[PDB]
Amino acid sequence: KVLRDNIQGITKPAIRRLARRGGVKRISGLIYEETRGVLKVFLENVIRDAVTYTEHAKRKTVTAMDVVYALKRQGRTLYGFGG
Amino acid sequence: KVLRDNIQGITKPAIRRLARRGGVKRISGLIYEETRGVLKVFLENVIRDAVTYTEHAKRKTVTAMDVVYALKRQGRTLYGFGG
Amino acid sequence: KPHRYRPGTVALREIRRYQKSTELLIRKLPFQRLVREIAQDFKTDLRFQSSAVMALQEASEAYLVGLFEDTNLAAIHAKRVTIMPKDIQLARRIRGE
Amino acid sequence: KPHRYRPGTVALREIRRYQKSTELLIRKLPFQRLVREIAQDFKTDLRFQSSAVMALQEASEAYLVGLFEDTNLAAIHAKRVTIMPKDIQLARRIRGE
Amino acid sequence: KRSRKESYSVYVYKVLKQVHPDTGISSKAMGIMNSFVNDIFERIAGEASRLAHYNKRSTITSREIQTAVRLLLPGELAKHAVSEGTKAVTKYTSA
Amino acid sequence: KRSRKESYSVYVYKVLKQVHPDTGISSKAMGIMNSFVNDIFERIAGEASRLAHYNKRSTITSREIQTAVRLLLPGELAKHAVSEGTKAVTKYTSA
Amino acid sequence: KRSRKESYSVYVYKVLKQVHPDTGISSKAMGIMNSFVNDIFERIAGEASRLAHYNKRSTITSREIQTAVRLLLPGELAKHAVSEGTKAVTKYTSA
Amino acid sequence: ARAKAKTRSSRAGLQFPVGRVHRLLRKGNYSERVGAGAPVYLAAVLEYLTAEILELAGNAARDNKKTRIIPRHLQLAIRNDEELNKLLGRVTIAQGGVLPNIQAVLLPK
Amino acid sequence: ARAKAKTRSSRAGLQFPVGRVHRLLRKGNYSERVGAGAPVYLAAVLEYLTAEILELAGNAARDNKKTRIIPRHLQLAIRNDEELNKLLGRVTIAQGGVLPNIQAVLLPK
Amino acid sequence: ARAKAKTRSSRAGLQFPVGRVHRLLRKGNYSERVGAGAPVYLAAVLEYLTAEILELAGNAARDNKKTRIIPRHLQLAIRNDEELNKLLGRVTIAQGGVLPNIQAVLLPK
DNA sequence: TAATCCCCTTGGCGGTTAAAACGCGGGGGACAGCGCGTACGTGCGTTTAAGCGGTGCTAGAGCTGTCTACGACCAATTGAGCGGCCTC
DNA sequence: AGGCCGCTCAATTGGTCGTAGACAGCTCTAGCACCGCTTAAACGCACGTACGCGCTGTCCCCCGCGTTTTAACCGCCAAGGGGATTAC
């Protein structure tokens, strides 16, 4: 029922490709796990607010629009999913 | 009654004092004019907002509430001036 | 002799290509499972719209790319081309985090 | 011989002395003259509450201070103690300036 | 049917044909521009509300909106927006 | 002839003497406290308006305000504020 | 036909559901709770009696009980107890 | 005819019975006369201490993945607090066990 | 006996819905009254910004020899206008990619 | 003929005005209608928050052997708490100075 | 929007070292050339769960009559709470 | 100058009222979750190739420092009117 490890599912070549999109030419081996940790922290911050929205909505299925609300709260407003 | 060179009125030892409050030990010679320029830009932004407030308030005297609102709009909210 | 590129060449080609390209670089379904397993860390048995998963995705990669641009700025400010995690923690402190 | 402290000792005495201080580090009259000077460019004959001038003073002082913790975090990141204005520009541009 | 939901597709399309009669548009870009117009609408509306409290004004007028534009929107964009809105409000004032 | 300007001085003085009867105060510290109470009041109130708009609620209730507490107020302070807020609404409904 | 036996059941149940709304109760833990309540009640009551004797006071007020809290309970929880007790007598005199 | 009554527990807004604590004080032979702040102060103190130890019981139960309190959790909560140990040094707990406490010389290597 | 119900957008000579903007401001809780030139002015600002963004998007689509507006074109247009950039610094475009930005120190000799 | 004036702040038992917070929320143009639990909950939250501000101010003043609060005490109170720092990362304080904060690289040897 | 007033700011002035300004012996700082251990981009085969496209379905998303809790508002009245003060 | 204490003022709120808000119930239905299917994308992995990072000694130099000087800052003083505000 429960899942224990899918932060590994954000794989190392995915991080490598993003740092290429992020412009990093050489990536330490120490980078991948701490990037996983800090994105872990940020996603917890986003989804905690999203859950707060979710039972503030009396719903059980999470929608994208509250994700938009939470990201716009955190100063990371995204275009392409509002409404 | 025109004023010309009061950016140098913010003195070099005042810059040293601020960096001591900022915890900077050693300060290059290139620093002081760059600090003068960036504070000039920051002040220009803040008082541009304040002037916009004052003309929209149809006033002539610059008030600290306008300073407070301008700093709020730059994400630099200040406590302690009647806010 | 089989062809082999010097180090950084394929990296620079990748840099050019994913600056050119716009697609997601992380697998969507392990990402989705991560979303669900951290959801149950807050509230169990939550369901997720695939749109919500994707919006969370490009939020995640955009946030990441912003951090890596700041990381590159710190690293070249540290006179470096390889980033080490002190760069990322420094930029995180600079962002006020 | 006159007593002479080594370079950096008086600097650190200034560090502790101005962190324990709470008072303003800018002369009041030339700062007021400067704000009248710059604001006269944007709107003529502008008058300033002296309290508003002091608020501008304190906000500017603290803004430059916060810029300076950003600066010396970049400097210890760049393994230097003599900060140079590329550190400030790094802090600004990573901050988004 | 379903409930009619308001979007800015048709006005973006009319303005697009004003500026580019020849091109098409993706619905993803249409939604991004809908998010844009809603976001900037909320930014300017909230700032006009801020100044309405700052000036203790129970009514937000075009003076307030122009003030908010001069705050948020930078420079030449701000002044040509002033020109465009002034021209539009003179035409609407003259109907 | 003068006009009254409202401030939170007596309440902060009350709770200060409630928590520290022997502790004095300076007026500019009270200026910072007034800035504190107005700043956080506007933060949470804007968040509550956001939640009212998002869930199409024309009424900002206890659920909206506690939702804003869980959003903006982080961690341990949030769960305490939940605890005394629940206590406060409970004893208010008994009042 | 039986006779009522009193306990501290529902009050501890209330405050546990105040601090932990989802946490259950084993009954002999509740017996330990009742015995703890009576034990500490009797300790403080005997302390109030001895202070009443030593001050030659035939009336035991909140000053005696505050003294008893100062005596038995060491430091941190004692000053916390003074805090809610002062707030409680304050709100009770206001009620 | 009569004002509708609130409990003095509700007047304090506290859950412990102020009437019960006051009558157990007056009938406990400590003083024939009791000041008004004494039982409400006592009840506030008691409710705080019970609330604090119940918070310890709840989070200790959540540590052991158990939804409900057990006196093993109460033993762990009393014995791992310094000030509650000072409160209850000589106090015996039914079916509580002890701390997991192994001396350093008892451990191998 | 009413005359022609004319649209206020065309009264402003404009495309953006004056009725929608004015209704949203009446229902958006900013001021209970909104000045008459306020939504007309606001929608004029919106249409001016929208028109220049759509012009940049069409020119960028023509630059990459495409005839349809793409979120990549939106990224490459808006992120390359510095006043639109600092107007929208913390704004994410979904599937827009990033600007092609290689540092000069990263480029070889 | 009339009920006795007993304020809703006293009904909350809290020093923060229920009436003033409620009228500032209603005047603040967030909703025309505000649920009853909202201002009392907000006043409870604010009074709690200002309370731990006041103990942090009090023991900061007690550390510096003055009985009166100075905004240097406020600087030391705010900047030494991580949740208050997260609350006030961007907030500027009048005449507070900074934390006593020196990097380890600045010290001799 | 006309008044206006009074109070709060703006220019002026008679001295003062606090503050700025200045030049100098001086230790520290910054930092590239280059050896040197080394930390990771890279060809490229392999696994397997990811991707794809494919199905029965129901938990909740969303929609629709209800109805009662729910909270704003007006003449009134108050008890708290603020404009003043002075003084320890 | 905190604070305190006598003075005023608007603010706060209770009883009632009239109206709408959203909560709960409830059905419905369409996409989420689930399940079994095929596929080459992912993948991650050990490997030998080329390159990163920060460091010794040095090298050059750059402000930090320590008093002197100085002119204008600061704190005080008497004068003008600006504009900010406030009832209409």
Author numbering:
A (entry chain P), B (entry chain L): 20 to 102
C (entry chain O), D (entry chain K): 37 to 133
E (entry chain N), F (entry chain R), G (entry chain H): 30 to 124
H (entry chain G), I (entry chain M), J (entry chain Q): 10 to 118
What is written in the article reporting this PDB entry?
Here, we report cryo-EM structures of human H1-containing tetranucleosome arrays with four physiologically relevant NRLs. The structures show a zig-zag arrangement of nucleosomes, with nucleosomes 1 and 3 forming a stack. H1 binding to stacked nucleosomes depends on the NRL, whereas H1 always binds to the non-stacked nucleosomes 2 and 4. H1 contacts DNA with L1, the amino-terminal part of α2 together with L3, and α3 to stabilize the nucleosome and contribute to chromatin compaction.
In our structures, we observe a compact stacking of nucleosomes 1 and 3 that is similar to type I interactions with a contact formed between H2A–H2B dimers. The observed stacking does not allow for interactions between the H4 N-terminal tail of one nucleosome with the acidic patch of a stacked nucleosome and thus leaves the H4 tail free to engage in other interactions. Whereas the inter-nucleosome interactions appear to be very similar, we note a slight relative tilting of the stacking nucleosomes that positions their dyad axes almost parallel, in contrast to type I interactions in which the dyads are slightly tilted toward each other. H1 is absent from the stacked nucleosomes of the 4×177 array, but is present on nucleosome 1 in the 4×187 and 4×197 arrays, and is present on both stacked nucleosomes in the 4×207 array. Particularly high Δβ values are found for entry DNA at nucleosome 3, except for the 4×207 array, which is the only array where H1 is observed on nucleosome 3.
